[PDB]
Structure formats: structure tokens, C-alpha cells
Design a binder for this molecule. Structure first.
Ligand SMILES: [Cu+2]
Ligand SMILES: [Cu+2]
Lengths: 105, 125, 382, 125, 381, 105
């Protein structure tokens, strides 16, 4: 499956775009916890603090296996391309109190 | 060897527990099991997640952020045990909690504790 | 290796008994013993073995200072002991090839006299939270028919295990809270990230009803991982890193916050005194007293052993005693009978020191308690 | 103690390694884990097979055959560890050999080593 | 606190880590590989005083550095390919720590990634559970078969195809013990009556077992740890008094050498006896025999020893006698040109590395588990 | 199933009737490797030495379960009555090298 992965492992923040659809991570929070996007859209997480974070989608959300994203150090980003309408929940692997949700229309 | 004394970092031996990066290490130093300071021993699985603490380098007097990721899928190495808790918070603040087995995201779903590595992931202050 | 006094006298009366048997021509007929019936002075010591793949629990008669049994576990198990002495149990984890291969998480219930397993209940999808052992991360309901255990990853939840029917039930989704303090078959409290408690109340089916309390402490006031909880009293005793003590009264199934109390004086705090160790606190129900492990220590040395126990009146909290323990003590608990024993377990000595709680005097000890013993559990049978 | 000196029996303390019945014990004394001199701890399974040895009882001057039956189906007790070898032979004389896990015959096919008991079969011979 | 090689090694490692940071080069964590198996790699096996789970230490005998570790089960039998291409063990696990269903199996490990490349279950729980004797589980000289001993319900030797990763079968064998392989299809054992068995086995059918003459009296006790060089085909068997029996089998049949004593007559009357675990080493290039020895009562024969005598195998001439400086339980050697001597202390949980010719202590490796007893070397060159 | 057990426990050698099929045990050996008996016959093993010994038939030999006989001290005896024709192997539980056969005709 229900999305695909640009990078397998994360990249410098710079390599961005501008007006790219982004979710900032700061203060132990995904800063947009309910992102509404469209099919084919690429969401980029950007880590803003020294504390490593990632995005983690359980088994049966993006396809049969769980997507356990890689940790982004301060000011790395990682992205994912959504490819089907539905709601996808994620959370950060060390920090399961940090939860978000990508709504694909 | 006064267990209750203030922590005193050293930058000259990574296999002693008062080595400066091991300031919130809980477990065993990976270097004493065929790893290195920032690498896992052969055969073990490298965790991605971890607890963190900020540790002061007495060498260039800055603090640096340590990610205490575990090498997993092996019984505890039993060599170079340390437990330091500089900045360590209870479990309800997991980001900084060091009793948690930090093995999530390891290859093959390995969840057993072998040893902890002390890589720098940046800098706090 | 190198015997305690209790060992010598038991070893000596044992050699005298056996000599007398031989002189009577009584044949040795080997058999398998039963342990004595659970009583108020039975104490359990769990050895997490510094993260070793396999672990041991030692069943001890605290009155005699004798090992009366043992139970094997897997990686970082959570022990529980029924208050009424009818059974003991743990949530445990094993691997098909020592520390790798397939993981199986399971609950075992044991008969407390034969020590035989009477149930073995597998937990689907390996849901246990692998953490250094915190007693209140796995907990019995007050009728013992149910065990509740915490899951940390991939999301906060509490597994419900029906002990009576020997079956796993279901995972409950809960808030970003930690630890489990049951008050009934279907109600328990937890402690949250934002400094509230959550009350969690669950039906047969469906999402539970959650009720938060006020925040009861600031974000820069740290509540230890080993609070004391008396299920029978409904008394939750929660120290912070400075020995301030939060008491929450859960006896009505709704949090009544009790006045806060400092375990350490103003002058002791200026002097560097702070709680430290593992099971830092104990609570004696009938006497309504709190016991806290304290020492002079730097502030980030909060897991190190302590040499002293302060004892305070929980209602007032007037200091009643301060004991110099004579050993590096990581964990304390008390028996729940009239003139309690004060248990003091040293992880580094691998030794349980058994003390008169009233005078603080060391009475006897039991050494050779595995590799890194940390957790002491007692039944409150009275 | 000197490890290499002739072993010297006592008849005053069964939890000690110089206890006369322990003349050829290998492992751990069952009395130290909730068993007794001649009985298995709760939860463990009693072997019916053993190595044997005549041990000298200093109390009555007699030699007795001790059967070192293991108690099995538990991880090693780790309490009161002993290794004596009076009359102990190599493995091709298994009947007198003590490195062998003597668990055969235990209920439930328990073959793990917990501890050893020291019952008298009979005498002199 | 630490050794000694470990401080100098932890400081070297701390200089180079402060150098990587002074240059601003990021920590990029991954999984190491061990150095290639060399002549001086040592394996230290921890039977952990009969614990249900056990550990193997892979050591840099030259640097005195733990280069890795292998987990095992209850009393596993380690084997190391002479030619350095793999390591393996026969191991035992249980479904609930030390009880429930038993699984006996063989695992074969890559000697540099230390990953398992085969897991081979043995039907019907056939492993002989005993304090660890290296020649109870043994590789055939060609390295494609593992042979292990079964004691109960009847003596038998199991045949495991490592090449094909499959258990083959149990060989019925007579009241003998230990497994010294000479051919890809032949091996010898030692018997209760005092003889040897020759067992030559062939895919299916009865194996061909022949007997040798009884070669020692019934009241001469041959130890549980004889040293055996499969390359040379020499089996050095010490007794509880120092007499050495040698059998030459490098021709596929038994040629008993003349009997040899490792103690002067003087020493035996003065109380001296061999004692410990792996009491005897044998060096191959140099036809030497090393024997842990000390003053003791006759029947204190598993106790540690503080001395090792050296001796030429053909002559029986004393060539040397070292004061070891510790309680030593187990001795081995590297099989290379100038050889290391190994001195394992079960009590210190420490491997002392000695210069073979002088007898001098060179370095140490500590914290080797709970009760390390068994030293294994690959005879490479 | 193939045998009945006359006495669960070992009994004293003195007990054994005068015309009786007896296997002595001494010097770590059963007296006969192979005993020939008729259907309905009782065999009695008698231990003559101080070393304890038994008779053990593995599962499936005399019945579904193993028949593990009791350990016999010096001058104790143990019986089995063989109720079916066949050949039945046995060993001494601590001493696998002690092996015998009962041939029942
Ligand atoms: Cu995070
Ligand atoms: Cu026998």
C-alpha cells in the first residue's frame, strides 16, 4: 502492498524540494499528527532535534510486513510514497508515545 | 570504586566504565566481546532504537549525545559490565530510560541483550 | 562458597540427624520433597542475572534463613505471588536456540508446595515488555483469577490472562501510561507520561473506559520505577529521586491523593542524602509504615546500593527509625505479619540479609542467590 | 584450604564439601537448594542411576557405598558447589565416574543437572 | 578491574576514537567480522558448572583479544576444523529452560561472520551429557562428517553429514568410549576391557569393528582428556601417575609405542601426580607432550595444577618444567612454528597465554564466563 | 503386553524357591547374555555384589512403556514373568554396557 520507499536508508535535509509535503519532528512529537494527502504523494519526515526518531508502520498497514523506518539523526529526513486510498498509522520505534497518521484520499 | 560518588569521565580507556561515552550505559561494553566502541560483535544483531543521554568529553570539554543501541540475539556477554545513569529518567520517560532492553529494529527480530555500543549521534548543550 | 551462621547450624543439625539414622540402621530411601506450606515469613528472591537468557527464583523461609525451593525462568521474567499463598506465577520468555530463534512468551502458574507447574499459557505475538524487572509491570487481580502484564512496543497495552481458565484473553489499548496496579477483577491504575495516573476499567469486550486524574507531580520530579503497592490496603507509595513520597490511596477504586511526605529531612537533603537502589521502598500494611533505602550520593547515582533504611509513619510521616544496614543494599521488602522481618538484598553480594524491622538488627543471611539478585516478593496473607 | 591435599572427612556439617558422604560428589549439594542430604528439592526429578564411591565415615570407622543420584529437570542450583574424587575412575569405568550427568531414570526424562544427593546404599564390602 | 593487554588495547582504541572525532568523522555502527582463522586463534568453552546455557569464547591468542562468542546449550561439544574453514558443536536445549521437550542438534558456524550455516537436529536425544571431553564429539579428517558418542540406552556413535546437513545414523559399537577419527569412514575408541575398537563404517550395514590387544592393566586409570593429533595420528594417553601410553594410528591401524613416565621415580615417591581437566597437550611439528602436574594425594586428580613438565615423545626425556604462576586446570598449545602454551584457570575464569619454550607468562584474558574448562586449537599449517 | 511383574519392589535373595530360573549379577556382568525360557516362565535376577544394578527394557520391548526395574542392592532379587514368545533385550540403567537378552519360547 500500500506504499513504496524512495530511500531505503535516510538522507541530508537540503536534498528537499521546497513546498515538498513535510512533517517536522521536534519536542518528542510528529508536528502534523494527521496529514491529509493524495495518492502518489511523497511525505518527508524531517528530524529537527538531536534525539533520534523514525516512523514505524505495523504489520498489515503498508503491506504484509511492518515498515520499521531508519533513525534520523539531527536534520536527516526520510520519505515514503503513498500509492492507495486508506488511513495509515505510524509511531516512532524507541518512542511509542509519538504517534501519527497519513490519510490518503 | 565509591559507587555513590559523582561520575568522573576519562578519555583514555573504552573498556573501563568511567570511559566518557559510557555515561548512561546499562549492560556490557561491546568492545570486550569482539565488537568495538560503535560496532557489534560478529553474529549479533544491531538494534536501531535506543535510549540516549548527553555525555561530557573531558578532552575537548563539550557534551555529545550517545545512542546506546544494543547488540542482540546472544546471551549477555558477561565481560565489562557497567551501569551508569547520567541523566537517566524513569520508564515513563523511555527516551532517556536505561533498564529497557534497546533491541527493537534489530535484524531477525533479535530481542536478547548481548552488549551496548557507545556511538556519538550528535551533540546537546 | 563460605558458609553463613544459619547454614552451619542447619548443616550441623542435619549431620546429627543423619548420624542418628545411620546408628539406628535406618536405610536411606531417596524421595522428592515438598516445600513447607506458604506462611507470612516465606520470601521469594528473583535473580534477573544481569540480563542473562535464563534466570532463577529462590524460595526462602525467612524465619530459618533456608532455601526451601527454586523456580527456573527465561529472559527477564516477571514474578507474581498470590497474597493468599495459593499459588505463584510468572510471565517469562524463551528462545528456540538459547537467545535467538523463535521467541515464545508464556505464563506459568506453580503449586507453591510441590513447585510443579499447573498451567503454561502461551502469549500470542511475543507481547511482553523486556525490561529490568519491575514488580508492578505484571500483576495479579485481587481474586488471583487474572494476571495483567504490560506491553511497551509497538504500542502501549495491557494483556489480560485468565489464570482460572488457563487462557490468554486479549490486549487492551491504553494511554501513554506505565505499570499496573489492580484494584479489582476489571480495574487497575497506571502511571502516565504527563504525570497523571490513568484509571483503566475493562469489560468482557471492547475498548476500556479510561479516567485520568490531575497531574500529581511536575515534569522535573522523577517517580522511581519501583513504587510499593499494597493491593490489600490499596496503598500506592511512590518515591521521587529526592525521597519525597507520593501516597495515593486506591482503596475505593478511585485515586484519593494523600498528603505528600519527605522521607529525608531538609538537612539530610542539603547534605547529599537521596534514595538509591532498585526496590528502594517497602510498605508494611498493618503498621502503616514506609521503609526507604537512602544514602549520601550524587544525584545521577540513583541505582547504586544504599547503606541505610529510613522508616516512617505513613499517616504522619514522622521518622520512626533510621538503620545502618552493614552491607551494600539494592532492594528491600518486609514480611506482612505482626513483628515483621525487614529483607535487604544485595545484588553485588548475591545475598539476602534478614533483619528485625523494629530494631534493624541483622538476624541471619542467605548467600549464593544467583548472579545478580534484585527482586524480593512476599505474600500478605493476614 | 589447600586444594591438592588428601581430602579429610568430617561428620559435623552436610553443607560443607568435606562432609564424609561427599567423598565423590560432583556438582552441588541438594541440601542447599530445598532438598536434604538424601532427598531432591521440590519440582525436581529424582534419578535412579548414579556413580558410586565407598566413603569413610570418621564417626564409626566404617566405609559406606554412597549413590550420587542427581536431581534433575532444573538449571544448576549454583549453591554449595563441590568437586571431590575419592576412588573416582575415568569414563570407561562409568560406575565410579563423576563427570557424567547421572539423571537416567528421573521422572519425565529429566536430564538436566540441578544438584546431587548422598544416600547410603550399604557397606564396607 | 582489568588486564594489562586489555588496558593497552582499550587505550589504543580510545586514542583512535578521539582521533576520529577530532577529525569530525561520523560513527557509522555495523556488525564486525572476526580476523581469518590463524594458527594462534584459541577457543575457550565455558561448560558453566553444568548450567543449562553455556558460552564459547573465540580469542586472538596473539593480541589476547576476544574476537567473538558463540552461544550454546547444556554441556555442548565443540569442534574446530583443522583447516580453519568452519566451527561446529553438538548442543542440547529444552522447551522450558531445563525441562520440557529436549532437542539435540548440531550447528555449524562460519568462522568469520560467526553465523550458523547449518542446524541439524538429531532424533531421539542421543548426545552423551557429561562434563565436556573434546574427543566425545569429533570431526573425520576430511571434515564432512561429525561423529558423536551416545552412552545410553546403549553405546552408539552418531553420524552426521555436515556436507549434506543431515543426520545419517547411529552406529552400534561395543563397551568403548571416545572418538578418534583416522579416515573419512574410520575412527578409534577405547574400551572397558582395556583394548581399542577400530570402527570403519559404510553408508548402511553393520560397521566393521575389530579389536586390539588389551594394552594397560585394569588397575591403571587412563584419563578422560587424552590429547590427539589427527594430522600426526598420535594419541597421547596419561594415567593418574604420569605413565604415558601412545598409540600410533597414522597408518589406519594401532601401533602402540614403548611406555613413557613424565615424572622421575623421585617425584612419584615425593607425592607428585598429574591433575586437572585437559591435563595433557601434544605438539605435532615438535613431537612434544606437556603435562599439568603438582604435589597431591592420589585421588585429588581433577584439582588445578601449578606446574607443567615438557618431554620429547620418542625418548621420555624431561626437556623442561615451568612454574605456571596460577591455579591451572586446562592446558593446550598452538600448533604453529614457535608455539603458545595455554593455561586455563577455571577458578580465575582466565586464560593465561604462556611462551611455549621458556614457560613464561606473556598475557591474560579474563571474565571467560562462569567455569571455563576446554581449550581448542585449529592445527592449520 | 509381554511380561507381568511379580513384585514391584526388590526382595531378598533368600526368598527365591529352589528350582528357579536365576540370573546372577557379579563383577559388572549378567551371568548369562541370553536366557532361554518358555512362555509363562518367571526369571529372577539376583544381585551378588555391592554395586547396585537393575534390569531395564526400553519402551516397546515388553509393552508400550519402558520397564525400568528397581535398583537391587547386594543380595536383592527382582522377577518378571514372560507371557509371550519373542526375544527381549535389556540393560543396566547406569551401566549400558551390561546387556542381556531373554529368549522366550
Ligand atoms: Cu522518536
Ligand atoms: Cu549395573
Amino acid at each position: 502492498d500500500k506504499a513504496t520507499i524512495p530511500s531505503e536508508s535516510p538522507f541530508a535535509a537540503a536534498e528537499v524540494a521546497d513546498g515538498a509535503i513535510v512533517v517536522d519532528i521536534a519536542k518528542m512529537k510528529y508536528e502534523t499528527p494527521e496529514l491529509h494527502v493524495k495518492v502518489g504523494d511523497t511525505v518527508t519526515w524531517i528530524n529537527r532535534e538531536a534525539m533520534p526518531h523514525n516512523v514505524h508502520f505495523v504489520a498489515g498497514v503498508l503491506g504484509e510486513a511492518a515498515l520499521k523506518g531508519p533513525m534520523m539523526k539531527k536534520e536527516q529526513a526520510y520519505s515514503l510514497t503513498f500509492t492507495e486510498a486508506g488511513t495509515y498509522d505510524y509511531h516512532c520505534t524507541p518512542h511509542p508515545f509519538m504517534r501519527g497518521k497519513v490519510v490518503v484520499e | 570504586t565509591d559507587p555513590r560518588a559523582k561520575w568522573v569521565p576519562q578519555d583514555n580507556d573504552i573498556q573501563a566504565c568511567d570511559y566518557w561515552r559510557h555515561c548512561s550505559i546499562d549492560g556490557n561494553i561491546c568492545d570486550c566481546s569482539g565488537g568495538s566502541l560503535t560496532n557489534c560483535p560478529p553474529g549479533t544483531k544491531l538494534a536501531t532504537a535506543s535510549w540516549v543521554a548527553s555525555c561530557y568529553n573531558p578532552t575537548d570539554g563539550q557534551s555529545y549525545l550517545i545512542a546506546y543501541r544494543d547488540c542482540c540475539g546472544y546471551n549477555v556477554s558477561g565481560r565489562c559490565p557497567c551501569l551508569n545513569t547520567e541523566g537517566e529518567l524513569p520508564v515513563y520517560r523511555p527516551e532517556f530510560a536505561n533498564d529497557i532492553i534497546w533491541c527493537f529494529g534489530a535484524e531477525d527480530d533479535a530481542m536478547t541483550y548481548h552488549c551496548t555500543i557507545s556511538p556519538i549521534v550528535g551533540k546537546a548543550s | 562458597e563460605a558458609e553463613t551462621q544459619a547454614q552451619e547450624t542447619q548443616g550441623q543439625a542435619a549431620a546429627r540427624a543423619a548420624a542418628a539414622d545411620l546408628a539406628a540402621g535406618q536405610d536411606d530411601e531417596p524421595r522428592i520433597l515438598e516445600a513447607p506450606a506458604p506462611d507470612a515469613r516465606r520470601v521469594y528472591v528473583n535473580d534477573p542475572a544481569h540480563f542473562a537468557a535464563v534466570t532463577q527464583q529462590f524460595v526462602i523461609d525467612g524465619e530459618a534463613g533456608r532455601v526451601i525451593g527454586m523456580i527456573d525462568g527465561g529472559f527477564l521474567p516477571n514474578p507474581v505471588v498470590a497474597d493468599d499463598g495459593s499459588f505463584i506465577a510468572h510471565a517469562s520468555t524463551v528462545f528456540s536456540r538459547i537467545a535467538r530463534g523463535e521467541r515464545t512468551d508464556y505464563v506459568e502458574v506453580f503449586d507453591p508446595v510441590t513447585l510443579l507447574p499447573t498451567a503454561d499459557i502461551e502469549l500470542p505475538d511475543a507481547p511482553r515488555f523486556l525490561v529490568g524487572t519491575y514488580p508492578w509491570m505484571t500483576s495479579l487481580t485481587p481474586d488471583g483469577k487474572t494476571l495483567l502484564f504490560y506491553q511497551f512496543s509497538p504500542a502501549p497495552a495491557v494483556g489480560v490472562v485468565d489464570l482460572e481458565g488457563k487462557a490468554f484473553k486479549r490486549m487492551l489499548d491504553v494511554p501513554d501510561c506505565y505499570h499496573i496496579f489492580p484494584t479489582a477483577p476489571d480495574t487497575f491504575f497506571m502511571h502516565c507520561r504527563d504525570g497523571s495516573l490513568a484509571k483503566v476499567a475493562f469489560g468482557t469486550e471492547g475498548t476500556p473506559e479510561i479516567t485520568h486524574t490531575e497531574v500529581f507531580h511536575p515534569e522535573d520530579e522523577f517517580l522511581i520505577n519501583h513504587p510499593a503497592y499494597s493491593q490489600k490496603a490499596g496503598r500506592l507509595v511512590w518515591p521521587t529521586y529526592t525521597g519525597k513520597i507520593h501516597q495515593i490511596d486506591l482503596s475505593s477504586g478511585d485515586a484519593k491523593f494523600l498528603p505528600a511526605v519527605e522521607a529525608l529531612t531538609e538537612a539530610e537533603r542539603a547534605d547529599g542524602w537521596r534514595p538509591g537502589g532498585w526496590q528502594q521502598v517497602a510498605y508494611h500494611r498493618a503498621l502503616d509504615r514506609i521503609y526507604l533505602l537512602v544514602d549520601q550520593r550524587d544525584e545521577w547515582r540513583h541505582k547504586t546500593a544504599s547503606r541505610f533504611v529510613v522508616v516512617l509513619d505513613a499517616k504522619t510521616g514522622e521518622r520512626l527509625a533510621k538503620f545502618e544496614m552493614g552491607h551494600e543494599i539494592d532492594s528491600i521488602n518486609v514480611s506482612q505479619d505482626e513483628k515483621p522481618l525487614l529483607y535487604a538484598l544485595s545484588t553485588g553480594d548475591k545475598t539476602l540479609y534478614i533483619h528485625d524491622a523494629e530494631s534493624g538488627e541483622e538476624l541471619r543471611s542467605v548467600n549464593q542467590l544467583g548472579h545478580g539478585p534484585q527482586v524480593i516478593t512476599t505474600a500478605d496473607m493476614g
